[PDB]
């Protein structure tokens, strides 16, 4: 055995390397940042008709102007989502204002290499999750990616999960910086339909759009049906 | 300042409490309930300092409820009175003592009706009848005079009315209405409020 | 201070005074003594100004955090119970705060009186502050559960107005809110001496 | 220290053209008793700064220990950086305020004199963390007797020579010896210039008692 | 005084081959009487009893915390406790609270496991053991009790003589104490039996 | 440090807790110990392993422990581990009594110790307690009761059960001769000896105890060697006939 | 018994205008009947659009000032932007209430620009209650200047009067005249008036003189 | 204190201690939960010398919510008791009875924490949490050693969960939901596919948790053979 | 084999393999260059993009008004070290009301990062920094590593292909002290571009600059703010 804080001969912590591999097992999710707002879409990956599709919440609201897409170990993500919601409200309390998308992404990111055995108070291992933070602030619509290494970057378009390689390839061929939010939603749905084993439907996937003056919105089944129609 | 009364019969316990929630010189509420059901056959009537009372009574309630969930059966009025005492007496020498004066009424399937008196100091006494507050000074002697251990519930209700009528005639505090309840083999029964 | 709130046929009326004082000096002629926690939940303030502002802003933060966690608004009973538990933790610390948690939830209109002692009362009529007795007198006299929204606005307006007249620690303006089924509406922010002068000139 | 034991009276200070001069009697009093008539109440902090202290002597000695070590600590590095008089004044303000906030004050009122980069420095710090800079300072009873004489001269002539400043301080010590019932005719004059800190002592001001024959 | 908030009195007396323990039955707060049947003497063994006067919460608390330690002791030891050893158990329990004590002054009355030698003692509120060969008193009427005991007590009293003596010393003492009374209970502890009696006492 | 760690609180590839399973093996090597519930009482019958001629026999028992006024227990496993657990059982029973001023109901005392045993399987990095217990008792809720708990912190109520050596054979033997609801302390004591005879018979090699209700008070009594001898010869006679 | 507080006096005042905010103070520092220094201005620059006036116990003034200074740097590092006037006000309330049981004996008046470029004034009590104001006075002569601000700047008690909003020139003249009256009647106010003007262009400082006694 | 990382990532991205905890769930007795309109039912499969009362796997958490489990029984007791405490601690803090989602989210959070904190191994249990909310809405949730949770129309956990899930997927119809006795019959029929070997309890909206007696169970078992 | 696992284990060669493995993190981060003149300290770094759609990661961060840094390695450890530096700087201005002398800050980093190299279950920092500062001793360029050792530098380069950049800094070393700001920054850009592939050049998207000196507080130039400096580059 070796410690959770052991470096590989290449300069990377073995536990962080393996946590990234866990994300390759999670549901595929896409985010697209547009001048008119950020779009978030995720496959639920339902395994039984008996399972309530509403009980799978892979797109969450952090605050009115920020949303989050997750992949990997769904239970590890629930802890970081709560840490993000608490953060925004402690900032609202102290400073009477909203946080930037980057500030929230950075706050969640600080908890990444906060794991260990000896000399600790007390996480044993990293979080096996990847997050996409899509929201709007004074800098306009912003979309951020974060992985178990605590590395966060700003993205025009990003895909995470099992079919990350393929979905990003498709995103690259269709993304333009001037693309409308209507075209952003369509591309994400077409790319999501392509990568999933099961057929796409209004009760099979989740879609959320954050636009200035409209706030964070989670698309209804009736809204998802109208989008899938086109 | 508040009023609690209990009269225990051969097979029941009758209890009453004022309905005033007061602050300073104003009567903020006329319909305030001071009894807390702990079990199906146990009531905790609690009087005292501003916050202390709801805080203490509800902590005991939730723990008596946790016992029911944990074990499948409820605490007896005796075990519930002694558990109330252990917590109050344990806070006595602590930074946060509770200024609560309470009465615990209840009916046990094996031991029958029981009425307990507890000091704010957490002295526990089993009494055939009891009263808390300044009103107890004007009514304990009425109860001494007419109370008998074979007192029927209909007769105890009449004896209770005489104690409450005495508070209207001589008590300087305006205690207009009172909550009335009987605990028996079939549980807690809400009776009509004694009003003036 | 003089805060008042009363349930009636058309919802809950909540009116506050606007005076802050330091001894006999008036530190602020107009201060907002109502925290708008959300479109359906308000809080009135009386007592120590810092305690009122900080503690009610802490309830608001916890209410907002509840909505993010559950996707539903907090109930009036949970928000009032939350505030009294905060007060309870600081028992004997010298906090001074009198508030009424007014709102509308799955169980209709809600009005609770919460105190620095941890008092938590549900009721259909309360009044807090150094001028509460004057407000109770006027309010009690003209209150009927079947009051028009405009008739209730006069009862709440006059109750605060007469309390600023007799209570030296009350004055400024009346800030009045009407709690309806689909949220509150700030009715008015009216100068109390202008009201008192209007009532004097009507004699 | 909630109750001081051996205390020092006024500490004087005035900046001149090219440095600062600070003065203090060498007395430690136990109430009215002149118990120690030959203790130094002035300290050379480093080459640019000097501190004089009023109030409790055991607390002054403690600060002299803490400061003295900080200087030694710095000098081991030898990195071309040293505490300016202003930095010692800033540290000492934080030190007094911190102890005051724990309800355990260091019972002192001090005067810090300095000379760094051609600039004269004179700063006051008391047991509560009240700090400020001034062209002249006088602690204790000196704020009532000596500060009016320092300010009177500095009103006529704001820039004083090292000699004028020195004679003004000797005139102030003579007044303090006559009027302060907790003073002694034994004192020190410390001066900080381009050359560095120079503490002189024991000094005494000549007294005139011809008014006895009036 | 804290000890006078509840009132009450407790007493123990030696006999030739028997021991007696008595207490009043009032439970009252200040000048108001609450109940007339408050228990102040608790069995600790077959022939061993402890009586507690003072603050009613601490009378109940000390008796309960003492019964906890006693039960554990008899389980580990496999024997009923000796009277002297119970005194040392109470002294240690009370002394643990030396700088914030329980407001109770115990009195112990029992018979040595040699099924004979009577034992009486008392402890102050901070657990100072005091064994006597005659009587021990504790209460708001300790001055009255000492007067009655000093005058009435005789050395080798028969159980019947012991009963009349401890009964008369309790009744006459608590009849001069405003906050003691409402009846008297007496236990006569012999090798063969325990006799418990409630006396016909004043009710004011 | 990581090198020397035994990893006592971790799952094996099939979802097994190996230290817990190895603790049970220890109990199989301990002396046979059986419990039988009856209508008029409940009993404990255990094999004595301290059976040497030069032993003093100072205590009233070897494996039987009084816990409460209404409860007793017997052990099978590491005796020093069993001393810890029985002492803790006595403290839990007194903490309940101090608080409620009523004796702890039987099942509650068993669950409380089982929560300590379970904690040794989930955290701390310590080995578990190598003991299984058989508890006998009386309470105002379920009357005469018989429990069993193993090193895992798992427990159960029984009408007859066995732990220790040849436990399996004794449970199959008790399964055949146990007449649910029609059992009395007299017939159950006959069954206790009948079982121990096959799973092992001097009164020096056996140790019996009974829990009964006399005058509204519980009576716990370890039977004398002569009493046990009379019970063994009453069975020795029936076996020959 | 040792008292951790002392009253060092001084007056602060702020006015919020259409496109400006003035924060002003005297330069006197005292204790008892003594003057510590005559050059102790109570204005502290926090950002290029936020100034603060602090008055009361000087030990607490110096400390709360260094804490505010440190917290802004911390916020800039964390958010890669300067704190707005509103965020500094909201934060100061939490810092002041962090000492609810051992207060900072400081009267604070923040003055600067809001996110629309308009004048913003936030006034506080030692324990952290605050509000946005059109104008406010604090410190030793607070009660002398506040009624005149209410009258001349708020137009109170004046019927048939044209409500002309104050200009920077007119407000500067009023600050200079109120500190002259404060220095005439309040023993703790004097020596000089330090005025901070906040506009889109930044901060300017002006120093007019007051009575030396 | 024992600060050893027990649950860590394996090179292929697995949390081996959680998968071993799932293997322990798979070995437990079969627990089935079917959500209806007016009643939510829970059923568990079942020695002759053992006391049935002391080995029940359906537990009342509060008055408005209850749960069933599969896996390590001693582990389950610790979770069931920590949930019972949290139900009352929630009534003390907001004076509002716990929603069936709240306590499920609570149990799930507790479970997740044991997969990410030092010195502890995960809980070797899965749970089926049923109950009616304050607005009378019927709920059925499911937790697992990893900490994940979801709602279900019907679900099964333990020894033979795959075959009972396959039966419930093909047999959960609106017709079976229609009668309250038809919802009860679905649970018994689903358990009969694996199995005095059934334990059955029902929670009808405002009424208490009713644990059906063996004769009452046999009343429904007789009609199953007839149909 | 066995001497790889923990930082407390010395190999039979008198080496600590965990420290050496942590240094491999620095060599794998993208190139950064720091250099100084008589009045200024410059940080020039290459920003990698994780895809065309993703942005170029922030390689240069603010520490105080007189100190700025450029990172190479574990970005989470770089944030940890940045906040320690920012805080140590805050403490010095709070206590002394003067900037923390740059060499003193660097000693605290060496003292702080050595602690986990000698404690079981602990690991070194997987971050290497280039520190740009200005104080009473003029401008400074410092280098810190996952081994708690630190260096006072005239110029320096850490990261992927940093050997190529080091060679340019050594050859042009003599010109740096008398350099003006435009020329000193251009020297930094040329060393940075030597690491870059033959097919790749500098860009107003992948270039990041940080400048601190005699009159300038630490300032970070990133995209169009970087353009004036790149407008002087002329070859290879
Ligand atoms: B009221 O008189 O109770 C009023 C309540 C108040 C004041 C300001 C702000 C709010 C909510 C944001 C509420 N309280 C005061 O006027 C108190 C004095 C008081 C207290 C109790 C009874 C009568 C009067 N004043 C202050 O707390 C205060 N005054 C000046 C500066 N800071 C605080």
String of DSSP letters for chain H: ------S-B-TTS-BHHHHHHHHHHTTSPPEEEEE-SSEEEEEEE--TTB-GGGG--EEE-SSSEEEEEEE-HHHHHHHHHHHHHHHHHHHHHHSSPPPHHHHHHHHHHHHHHTTTBTTBPPP-EEEEEEEE-TT--EEEEEE-TTS-EEEBSEEEESTTHHHHHHHHHHH--HHHHHSHHHHHHHHHHHHHTT---EEEEEEETTS-EEE--HHHHHHHHHHHHH-
Question: What is the token pair recorded at D195?
Answer: 């050359």
Place of tokens 């860590």: H8
Give the whole-angstrom CA distance, residue B185 versus residue B41: 8
Helix axes A181-195, A221-229, angle to 10 degrees: 90
User: Hey, is F15 helix, strand or coil?
Assistant: coil
Enumerate the domain spans of chain D.
Answer: 6-213
Both tokens of residue A152? 């966060």
Cβ F101 vs Cβ F156: under 8 Å: no
CATH label of the domain that carries residue H217: 3.60.20.10
8 A C-beta contact, residue D11 and residue D139: yes
* Chains linked to I by 3 or more Cβ pairs within 8 Å: A, D, G
Q: How far apart are CA C26 and CA B71, in angstroms?
A: 61
Please give the Cα distance from A145 to A159 (Å, whole number): 9
**Dist CA E159 CA F196 (whole Å):** 53
Cis omega (within 30 of 0) on the bond before I112?
no
Q: Is E145 left (phi over 0), alpha (psi -120 to 50) or beta?
A: alpha
Of C40, C35, C111, the closest CA to residue C72 belongs to C40
Neighbours of A19 (CB within 10 A): 28
Structure tokens belonging to residue D2? 């909630």
The full set of domains in chain A, from first to last, is: 7-218 (3.60.20.10)
Q: What is the crossing angle of helices B135-146 and B153-170, to 10°?
A: 140
C168 lines ligand 1 (CB under 6 A): no
Domain D6-213 annotated CATH 3.60.20.10: yes
Residue whose structure tokens are 């008998």: B148
* Cα A28 to Cα I67: distance, rounded to the nearest angstrom: 42
Tokens of G12: 């602060």
Phi, psi for residue C37 in degrees, rounded to 5: -65, -40
CB C79 near ligand 1, within 6 Å: no
CA–CA separation, I172 and I178 (whole Å): 12
C-alpha to C-alpha distance for D187 and D173, rounded to whole angstroms: 8
| β-strands B129-132, B4-8 pairing | antiparallel
Q: Which residues pair with A30 in a beta bridge?
A: A41, A159
Where does chain G have alpha helices with state H?
Answer: 58-79, 85-97, 142-152, 168-185
Q: Hey, what are A187's tokens?
A: 């591309």
Residue from the list A6, A110, A118 with its beta carbon closest to the beta carbon of I79: A110
Rounded distance, CA B87 to CA B122, Å? 9
Indicate if ligand 1 lies below 6 Å from the C-beta of C49. Answer: yes
Report CA Rg, chain H. Answer: 18
Q: G11-210 maps to which CATH number?
A: 3.60.20.10
Instruction: Classify I73 in phi/psi space as left (phi over 0), alpha (psi -120 to 50) or beta.
Output: left
What DSSP string runs through B114-179?
EEEEE-TT--EEE-SEEEESTHHHHHHHHHHHH--TT--HHHHHHHHHHHHHHHHHH-SS----EE
Q: By three-state DSSP, how is residue E47 classified?
A: coil
Residue H209 phi/psi, 5-degree rounding, is -70, 115
Delimit the domains of chain I by residue range: 1-236
CB of D113 within 8 A of CB of D192? yes
Domain ranges, residue B144: 1-196
In this structure, the dihedral spanned by the alpha carbons of residues E29, E31, E33 and E34, taken in order and rounded to 10 degrees, is -30
Q: Retrieve residue B188's tokens.
A: 């807690």
Alpha-carbon Rg for chain D, nearest whole angstrom, is 17
- Domain F2-231 belongs to what topology? 3.60.20
Helices (runs of H) and strands (runs of E) counted in chain B: 4, 12
List the domain boundaries for chain E: 1-204
Sheet holding B112-118, edge to edge: B35-39, B42-48, B100-108, B112-118, B124-126
Q: And the tokens for H188? A: 């018994």
Cβ–Cβ under 8 Å, residues A160 and A171: no
Give A-chain residues touching F2 at CB under 8 angstroms: 1-3
CA E18 to chain centroid: 15
Identify which of C49, C50, C96, C164 to mutate to test ligand 1's pocket (most ligand atoms within 8 A of the CB).
C49
* Number of compact structural domains in chain B: 1
Whether the CB of G130 sits within 6 Å of ligand 1: no
Q: Chain C window 122-181: which residues touch B at a Cβ cutoff of 8 Å?
A: 123, 126, 132-133, 136
Tell me the C-alpha distance between F59 and F36, whole Å. 24
Residue of H88, H89, H131, H201 best to disrupt the B interface, most CBs of B under 10 A: H88
Q: Please say whether the beta carbons of C187 and C159 come within 8 A.
A: no
Which chain H residue has the Cα nearest residue C89? H93
Q: State which residues form the domain around H31.
A: 9-225
Q: What is the CA radius of gyration of chain G?
A: 17
Contact F105, F139 (CB under 8 A): yes
Per DSSP, the three-state class of E140 is coil
How crowded is the C-beta side of G38, counted as CA atoms within 13 Å?
15
Tokens, residue F238: 């029936």
Residue B82 structure tokens? 């002694």
| Residues A109, A113, A117: CA angle, nearest 5 degrees | 150
Q: How many CB atoms lie within 10 A of CB D152?
A: 10
In total, chain A counts a number of residues equal to 230
Count of CA atoms in the C-beta half-sphere (13 A) of I182: 7
Structural tokens at position H200: 């059955």
Tell me the shortest Cα–Cα distance from D189 to chain G, in angstroms: 22
**Resolution reading in Å:** 2.4
CA atoms within 13 A on the CB side of E40: 37
Reported as half-sphere exposure (CB side, CA atoms, 13 A), residue C36 has a value of: 13
What CA–CA distance (Å, rounded) separates I133 from I137? 10
Backbone phi, psi, residue B181, to 5°? -145, 145
B54 CA to middle of ligand 1, Å? 28
Instruction: Tell me the C-alpha to C-alpha distance, in Å, between residue I140 and each of H8, I66, I132, I176.
Output: 43, 10, 6, 13
Token pair belonging to D138: 């006088």
Give the mutation target among C20, C25, C50 for probing the ligand 1 site: most ligand atoms within 8 A of CB: C20
Which among I142, I75, A145, I94 has a CA at the least distance from the CA of G74? I94
Helices (H), C2-48: none
Cα angle value C93/C99/C100 (rounded, 5°): 150
Contacts of E182 by beta carbon, 8 Å cutoff, 6+ apart: E24, E25, E26, E33, E36, E201, E203
* C1 a catalytic residue: yes
Residue-range domain boundaries for chain F: 2-231
In the numeric block, the tokens 């021990």 are attached to E136
Restricting to H residues 77-136, those with a Cβ less than 8 Å away from any Cβ of A are 108-109, 111-112, 115-118
Task: For chain G, give every domain's residue range.
Answer: 11-210
C-alpha to C-alpha distance for E71 and G176, rounded to whole angstroms: 85
Element (H, E) at C111: strand C108-115
Distances (CA, A) of H41 to B39, D83, H44: 26, 78, 11
What span, in angstroms and rounded, lies between the C-alpha atoms of F204 and A208? 80
Closest CA to D57 of D96, D5, D132, D12: D5
Question: Six-digit token pair at E11?
Answer: 């007493």
DSSP H145-204: TTS-EEEBSEEEESTTHHHHHHHHHHH--HHHHHSHHHHHHHHHHHHHTT---EEEEEEE
Q: Are D186 and D26 in contact (CB under 8 A)?
A: yes
Calpha distance A120→I123 (Å, rounded):
13
Question: Which of I22, I65, I213, I41 is CA-nearest to residue I130?
Answer: I41
Method: X-ray
By CA distance, what is G101's nearest residue in D?
A: D101
Sheet of strand C125-128, all strands in order from the earlier edge strand to the far edge: C125-128, C3-8, C11-16, C173-180, C183-191
Cα D21 from Cα D17, distance rounded (Å): 11
A94, A103, A138, A154, best to mutate vs chain G, most G CBs in 10 Å: A94
- Tokens representing C34 are 């109502």
Q: Which two tokens stand for residue H218?
A: 């046999």
Q: Contact at 8 Å (CB) between H139 and H133?
A: yes
Beta-carbon count within 10 A of B104 CB = 30
């Amino acid at each position: 055995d070796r410690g959770v804080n052991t470096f590989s001969p290449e300069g990377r912590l073995f536990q962080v390397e393996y946590a990234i591999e866990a994300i390759k097992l999670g549901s595929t999710a896409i985010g697209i940042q547009t001048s008119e707002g950020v779009c978030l879409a995720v496959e639920k990956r339902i395994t039984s008709p008996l399972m309530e599709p509403s009980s799978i919440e892979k797109i969450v609201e952090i605050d009115a102007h920020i949303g989050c897409a997750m992949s990997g170990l769904i239970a590890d993500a629930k802890t970081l989502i709560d840490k993000a919601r608490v953060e925004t409200q402690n900032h609202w309390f102290t400073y009477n204002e909203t946080m930037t998308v980057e500030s929230v992404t950075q706050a969640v990111s600080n908890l990444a290499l906060q794991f260990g055995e000896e000399d600790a108070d007390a996480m044993s291992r990293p979080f096996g999750v990847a997050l996409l933070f899509g929201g709007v602030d004074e800098k306009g619509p912003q979309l951020f990616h974060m992985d178990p290494s605590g590395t966060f970057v700003q993205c025009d378009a990003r895909a995470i999960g099992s079919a990350s390689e393929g979905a990003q390839s498709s995103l690259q061929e269709v993304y333009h910086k001037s693309m409308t939010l209507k075209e952003a939603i369509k591309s994400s749905l077409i790319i999501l339909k392509q990568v999933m084993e099961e057929k796409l439907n209004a009760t099979n996937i989740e879609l959320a759009t954050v636009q200035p003056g409209q706030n964070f919105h989670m698309f209804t089944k009736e809204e998802l049906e109208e989008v899938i129609k086109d | 300042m508040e009023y609690l009364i209990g009269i225990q019969g051969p097979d029941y316990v009758l209890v009453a409490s004022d309905r005033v929630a007061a602050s300073n010189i104003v009567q903020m509420k006329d319909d305030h309930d001071k009894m807390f059901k702990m079990s199906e056959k146990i009531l905790l009537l609690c009087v005292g300092e501003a916050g202390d009372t709801v805080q203490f009574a509800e902590y005991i309630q939730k723990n008596v409820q946790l016992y029911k969930m944990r074990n499948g059966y409820e605490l007896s009025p005796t075990a519930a009175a002694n558990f109330t005492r252990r917590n109050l007496a344990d806070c006595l020498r602590s930074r946060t003592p509770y200024h609560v004066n309470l009465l615990l009424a209840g009916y046990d399937e094996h031991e029958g009706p029981a009425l307990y008196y507890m000091d704010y100091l957490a002295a526990l006494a089993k009494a055939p009848f009891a009263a808390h507050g300044y009103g107890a000074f004007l009514t304990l002697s009425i109860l001494d005079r007419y109370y008998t251990p074979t007192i029927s519930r209909e007769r105890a209700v009449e004896l209770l009315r005489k104690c409450l009528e005495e508070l209207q005639k001589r008590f300087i505090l305006n205690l207009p209405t009172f909550s009335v309840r009987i605990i028996d083999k079939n549980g807690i029964h809400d009776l009509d409020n004694i009003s003036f | 201070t003089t805060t008042l709130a009363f349930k009636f046929q058309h919802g809950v009326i909540a009116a506050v005074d606007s005076r802050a004082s330091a001894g006999s000096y008036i530190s602020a002629l107009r201060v907002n003594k109502v925290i708008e926690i959300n479109p359906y939940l308000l809080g009135t303030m009386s007592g120590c100004a810092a305690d009122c502002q900080y503690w009610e802003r802490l309830l608001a933060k916890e209410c907002r955090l509840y909505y993010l966690r559950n996707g539903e608004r907090i109930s009036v009973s949970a928000a009032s119970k939350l505030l009294s538990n905060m007060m309870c933790q600081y028992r004997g610390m010298g906090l001074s705060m009198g508030s009424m948690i007014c709102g509308w939830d799955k169980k209709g209109p809600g009005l609770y009186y919460v105190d620095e002692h941890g008092t938590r009362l549900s009721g259909n009529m309360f009044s807090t502050g150094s001028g509460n007795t004057y407000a109770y007198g006027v309010m009690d006299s003209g209150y009927r559960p079947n009051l028009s929204p405009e008739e209730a606005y006069d009862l709440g307006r006059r109750a605060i107005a007469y309390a600023t007249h007799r209570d030296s620690y009350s004055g400024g303006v009346v800030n009045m809110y009407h709690m309806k089924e689909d949220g509150w509406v700030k009715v008015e922010s009216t100068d109390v001496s202008d009201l008192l002068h209007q009532y004097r000139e009507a004699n | 220290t909630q109750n001081p034991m051996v205390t020092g009276t006024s500490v004087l200070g005035v900046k001149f053209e090219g440095g600062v001069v600070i003065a203090a009697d060498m007395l430690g009093s136990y109430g009215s008793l002149a118990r120690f008539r030959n203790i130094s109440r002035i300290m050379r902090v480093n080459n640019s700064t000097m501190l004089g202290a009023s109030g409790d002597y055991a607390d002054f000695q403690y600060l002299k220990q803490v400061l003295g070590q900080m200087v030694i600590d710095e000098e081991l590095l030898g990195d071309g950086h040293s505490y300016s008089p202003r930095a010692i004044h800033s540290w000492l303000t934080r030190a007094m305020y911190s102890r005051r906030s724990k309800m355990n004050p260091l019972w002192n009122t001090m005067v810090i004199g300095g000379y760094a980069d051609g600039e004269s420095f004179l700063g006051y710090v008391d047991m509560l963390g009240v700090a400020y800079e001034a062209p002249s300072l006088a602690t204790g009873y000196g704020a009532y007797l000596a500060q009016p004489l320092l300010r009177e001269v500095l009103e006529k002539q704001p820039v004083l020579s090292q000699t004028e400043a020195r004679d003004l301080v000797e005139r102030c010590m003579r007044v303090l010896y006559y009027r302060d019932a907790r003073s002694y005719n034994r004192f020190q004059i410390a001066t900080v210039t381009e050359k560095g800190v120079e503490i002189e002592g024991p000094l005494s001001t000549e007294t005139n008692w011809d008014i006895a024959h009036m | 005084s804290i000890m006078s908030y509840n009132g009450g009195a407790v007493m123990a007396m030696k006999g030739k081959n028997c021991v007696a323990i008595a207490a009043d039955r009032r439970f009252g707060i200040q000048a108001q009487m609450v109940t007339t049947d408050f228990q102040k003497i608790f069995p600790m063994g077959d022939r061993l009893y402890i009586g507690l006067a003072g603050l009613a919460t601490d009378v109940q608390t000390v008796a309960q915390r003492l019964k906890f330690r006693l039960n554990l002791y008899e389980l580990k030891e496999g024997r009923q406790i000796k009277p002297y050893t119970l005194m040392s158990m109470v002294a240690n329990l009370l002394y643990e609270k030396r700088f914030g004590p329980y407001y109770t002054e115990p009195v112990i009355a029992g018979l040595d496991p040699k099924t004979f030698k009577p034992f009486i003692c008392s402890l102050d509120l901070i657990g100072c053991p005091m064994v006597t060969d005659d009587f021990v008193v504790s209460g708001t009427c300790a001055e009255q009790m000492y007067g009655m005991c000093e005058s009435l007590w005789e050395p080798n009293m028969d159980p019947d003589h012991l009963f009349e003596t401890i009964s008369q010393a309790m009744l006459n003492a608590v009849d001069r104490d405003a906050v003691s009374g409402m009846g008297v209970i007496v236990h006569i502890i012999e090798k063969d039996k325990i006799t418990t009696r409630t006396l016909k006492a004043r009710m004011d | 440090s990581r090198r020397y760690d035994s990893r006592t609180t971790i799952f094996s590839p099939e979802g097994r807790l190996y230290q817990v399973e190895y603790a049970m093996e220890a109990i199989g090597h301990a002396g046979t110990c059986l419990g039988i519930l009856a209508n008029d009482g409940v009993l404990l019958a255990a094999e004595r392993r301290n059976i040497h001629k030069l032993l003093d026999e100072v205590f009233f028992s070897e494996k039987i422990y009084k816990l409460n006024e209404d409860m007793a227990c017997s052990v099978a496993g590491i005796t020093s581990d069993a001393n810890v657990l029985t002492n803790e059982l006595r403290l839990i029973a007194q903490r309940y009594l101090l608080q409620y001023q009523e004796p702890i109901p039987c099942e509650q005392l068993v669950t409380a110790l089982c929560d300590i045993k379970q904690a040794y399987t989930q955290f701390g990095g310590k080995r578990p307690f190598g003991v299984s217990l058989l508890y006998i008792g009386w309470d105002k809720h379920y009357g005469f009761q018989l429990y069993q708990s193993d090193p895992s912190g798992n427990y159960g109520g029984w009408k007859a059960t066995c732990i220790g050596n040849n436990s399996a054979a004794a449970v199959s033997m008790l399964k055949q001769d146990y007449k649910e609801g029609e059992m009395t302390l007299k017939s159950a004591l006959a069954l206790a000896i009948k079982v121990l005879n096959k799973t092992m018979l001097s009164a020096e090699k056996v140790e019996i105890a009974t829990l009964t209700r006399e005058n509204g008070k519980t009576v716990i009594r370890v039977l004398k060697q002569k009493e046990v001898e009379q019970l063994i010869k009453k069975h020795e006679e029936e076996e020959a006939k | 018994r040792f008292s951790p507080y002392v009253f060092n006096g001084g007056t602060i005042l702020a006015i919020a205008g259409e496109d400006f905010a003035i924060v002003a103070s005297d330069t006197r520092l005292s204790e008892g009947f003594s003057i510590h220094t005559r050059d102790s201005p109570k204005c502290y620059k926090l950002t290029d659009k936020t100034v603060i006036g602090c008055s009361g116990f000087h030990g607490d003034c110096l400390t709360l000032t260094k804490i505010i200074e440190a917290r802004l740097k911390m916020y800039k590092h964390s958010n890669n932007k300067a704190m707005t006037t509103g965020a500094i006000a909201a934060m100061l309330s939490t810092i002041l209430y962090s000492r609810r049981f051992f207060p900072y004996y400081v009267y604070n008046i923040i003055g600067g620009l809001d996110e629309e470029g308009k004048g913003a004034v936030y006034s506080f009590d030692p324990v952290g209650s605050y509000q946005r104001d059109s104008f406010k006075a604090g410190g030793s002569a607070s009660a002398m200047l506040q009624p005149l601000l209410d009258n001349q700047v708020g137009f109170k008690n004046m019927q048939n009067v044209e409500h002309v909003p104050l200009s920077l020139d007119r407000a500067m003249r009023l600050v200079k005249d109120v500190f002259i009256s404060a220095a005439e009647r309040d023993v703790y106010t004097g020596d000089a008036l330090r005025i901070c003007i906040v506009t889109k262009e930044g901060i300017r400082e002006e120093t007019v003189s007051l009575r030396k006694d | 204190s024992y600060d050893r990382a027990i649950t860590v990532f394996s090179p292929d991205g697995h949390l081996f201690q959680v998968e071993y905890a799932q293997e322990a769930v798979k070995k437990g007795s079969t627990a089935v939960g079917v959500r209806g309109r007016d009643i939510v039912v829970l059923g568990v499969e079942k020695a002759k010398l053992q006391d049935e009362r002391t080995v029940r796997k359906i537990c009342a958490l509060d008055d408005n919510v209850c749960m069933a489990f599969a896996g390590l029984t001693a582990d389950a007791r610790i979770v069931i008791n920590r949930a019972r405490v949290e139900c009352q601690s929630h009534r003390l803090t907001v004076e509002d009875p716990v929603t069936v989602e709240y306590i499920t989210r609570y149990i799930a959070s507790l479970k997740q924490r044991y997969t990410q904190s030092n010195g502890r191994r995960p809980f070797g249990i899965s749970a089926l949490i049923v109950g009616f909310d304050f607005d009378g809405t019927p709920r059925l949730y499911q937790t697992d050693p990893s900490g994940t949770y979801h709602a279900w129309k019907a679900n099964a956990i333990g020894r033979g969960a795959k075959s009972v899930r396959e039966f419930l997927e093909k047999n959960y119809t609106d017709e079976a939901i229609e009668t309250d006795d038809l919802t009860i019959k679905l649970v018994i029929k689903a358990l009969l596919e694996v199995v005095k070997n059934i334990e059955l309890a029902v929670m009808r909206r405002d009424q208490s948790l009713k644990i059906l007696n063996p004769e009452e169970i046999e009343k429904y078992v007789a009609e199953i053979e007839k149909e | 084999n066995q001497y790889d696992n923990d930082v407390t284990v010395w190999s039979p060669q008198g080496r600590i393999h965990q420290i050496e493995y942590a240094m491999e993190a620095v060599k794998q981060g993208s190139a950064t260059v720091g250099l100084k003149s008589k009045t200024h300290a410059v940080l020039v770094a290459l920003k990698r993009a994780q895809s065309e759609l993703a942005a170029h990661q922030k390689k240069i961060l603010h520490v105080d008004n007189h100190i700025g840094i450029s990172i190479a390695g574990l970005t989470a450890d770089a944030r940890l070290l940045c906040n320690f530096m920012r805080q140590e700087c805050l403490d010095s201005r709070f206590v002394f009301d003067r900037p923390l002398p740059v060499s003193r800050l660097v000693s605290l980093i060496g003292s702080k990062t050595q602690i986990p190299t000698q404690r079981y279950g602990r690991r070194p920092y997987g971050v290497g920094l280039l520190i740009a500062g200005y104080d009473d001793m003029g401008p400074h360029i410092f280098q810190t590593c996952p081994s708690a050792n630190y260096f006072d530098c005239r110029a320096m380069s850490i990261g992927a292909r940093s050997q190529s950049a080091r060679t340019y800094l050594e050859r042009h070393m003599s010109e740096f002290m008398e350099c003006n700001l435009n020329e000193l920054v251009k020297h930094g850009l040329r060393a940075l571009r030597e690491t870059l592939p033959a097919e790749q050049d500098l860009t107003t998207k992948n270039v990041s600059i940080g400048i601190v000196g005699k009159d300038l507080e630490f300032t970070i130039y990133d995209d169009d703010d970087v353009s004036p400096f790149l407008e002087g580059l002329e070859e290879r």
